[PDB]
Amino acid sequence: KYVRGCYFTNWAQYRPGNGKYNPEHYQANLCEYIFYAFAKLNDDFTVDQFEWNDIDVLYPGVMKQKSSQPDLKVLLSLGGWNAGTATFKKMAATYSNRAKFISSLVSFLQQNKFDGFDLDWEYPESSDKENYLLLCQEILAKFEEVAKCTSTSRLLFTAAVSANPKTVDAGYDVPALAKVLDFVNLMCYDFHGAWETQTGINSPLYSRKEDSSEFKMWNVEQSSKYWSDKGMPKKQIIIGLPTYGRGWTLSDASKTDIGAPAQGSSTATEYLREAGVISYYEVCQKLSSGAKRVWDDESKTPYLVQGNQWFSYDDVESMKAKINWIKQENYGGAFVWTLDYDDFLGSFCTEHNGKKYPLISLMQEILG
Template identity: 25%
Template sequence: MKGAGALAVTPFIGGVVGANGRNHGAKRNGRKNGRASDKRVVGYYPSWAADGYPPRDIPYGKITDLNYAFLEPKSNGEVKLAVTGDPAPGVLETFREITHEREDTAFHLSIQAGWYSGRYSDAALTPERRARFARTAIEHMRTYNFDGIDIDWEYPDGTIRESDPRNLTLLLGEIRRQLDAAEREDDRTYELSMAVSANASVAEPLEVGEFNDDVSFLNVMTYDFHGTWGERTHFNAPLYPVPDAPNATPKFTCDYAMRWWAKRPIAREKLHFGLPFYGRTFENVGGESRDRGLFQPFEGGGARTFADIRKNVEPSHDYRYHWHPEARVPWLYSDEEDVFIGYDDKHSIMEKTKYAVDNGFGGVMCWELSQDPTDTLLDTIGRHISHP
């Protein structure tokens, strides 16, 4: 979880968020965020980034929402501040100060339990555990003056328990019920969101039509479509398919995922397009140099942040930059080192942001902010989604 990759640095599988039937919009202390655009820019911030990228370095004027990652649930439903050794309490104390200073930014506590860990399944299993989950999560939210809860259950598709999709719906309903009570007591609006899978087969079991009134928006994780779990090099987050690729998977594209979610029983403007601020690397790439490393067998690899790629790879004479006219994303390839890097740069982030705006989606989500400390990608987003 603490690598360069996304909410789940694992094979392309995805997560969950719904729509909004009761206007649980982006508000703080009873008034709507004073942003110039009705589009959101949601940035995840992981606690482990605090040493090199402290909370006060975040460019709050360039995002509308900040999701703090991660709190985690125990099997009995209790939501803990952090895993042992994680710097969450100290970081959250700083965020509590910032929430009073940045009233035009919405702050959310994101809750995760790891990839198919089973603890989310345990926590959502009974009414008592669901009530404890909601109560303890909301206690943390109030303690640190946050504006909402973000659910990142990877994944409630029935793999751990057949009842997980139903229990997810019940869990979201219980959280929303307790948030409503907290709203009345505190005279402010609290949001409930969720990170959702871009993989239709994983997201299909979700009861979207039943929980859409309980959630405020979805962050679709449109990345990790390809990586070292595959057999050939490919792009981390292609916007469109490459039909003639030997490992072509048209459903594993951002466009397919967003169009699939747009057909679910949720409002299109409550869907956020996920943008990766990192790339996937493939090592020991086979094939001839004329192939430029694309769609070739490989051995080994991992992930690298956009900042690392920009500083240490792009300026290198060993790597050549390429742009794919169909996938609408770049890649770097070193014939000398036999390394392929599929990532997003200013050009592809611009095209994806425009895609989200032009197709009527609610905005974009970024994983994660510390991977772009110079705001290169955030500034690109901001040229197409304006803020105050």
């Protein structure tokens, strides 16, 4: 009745100390689907592994989890934000280029025992709309062809899609893609971040009265609605849950409101070491240090203040509110980004008595 998904990342193995995330850190029945991020798209449009140890170690490591969760399905994700669109745009522009990518892809999936493919082209533009459609149609066709041919279940085929309606209009033929994609993973996050000069919410459930006109649809609720109205069935919209936060350095540590002015990004944190970004477990460390929390009931998310540092993030209350809203509105489910941001050891946080995956466990718990 409800999809429950989780992104694994193949660079989380390089965090320092207990931030290091390995496939053995996964938990049985946490996720129905594990989206592996990412494969590499070569310049010649062929698919290969991205990290030097995927084929030999990490891919099989994730697959071993099926031993204790037999209907765990694992899909290979290609793209992401770092990858950009340059290869994608070229690869998709001709039938023969997509044929080379598709065929290369089908073979890389079979060899490495994946259950499906997840296209995270971030993002198709006007010039790519029609190409994108054909690319997906042809991926389903080959998958359909391969399945009848080899007498197997068809490979699964999903896309991570843009939550910004202006992009959805530009680059997605939504009714056509509905007929073709299994489901879409709605990236209803990153709505606000340190690229802005004032504090905002990362992933607000609802809009806020103080939002300006350009952002009245930049919430989970209204962005999922937009996909619904463009012709994607609600059951094929899967709601993105962010286990990370974004943060600013406050311009004045006395104005600490949603919208307070900021002079730059939050200082890079101990583990993710990316300025402007905090993992959930890092938040728990900060709480333990007398960082103060503030619920925002309008948007149903918390923020965190400590010194001149201000983070929007997501915790058990905000996650409880979104997943419940997933059920109340009958969207297709939830997915989490990422596994390695939660308190996967269950030792960085203390409010949860040591429960592993305080945040991600909510999916199986509430969505069954």
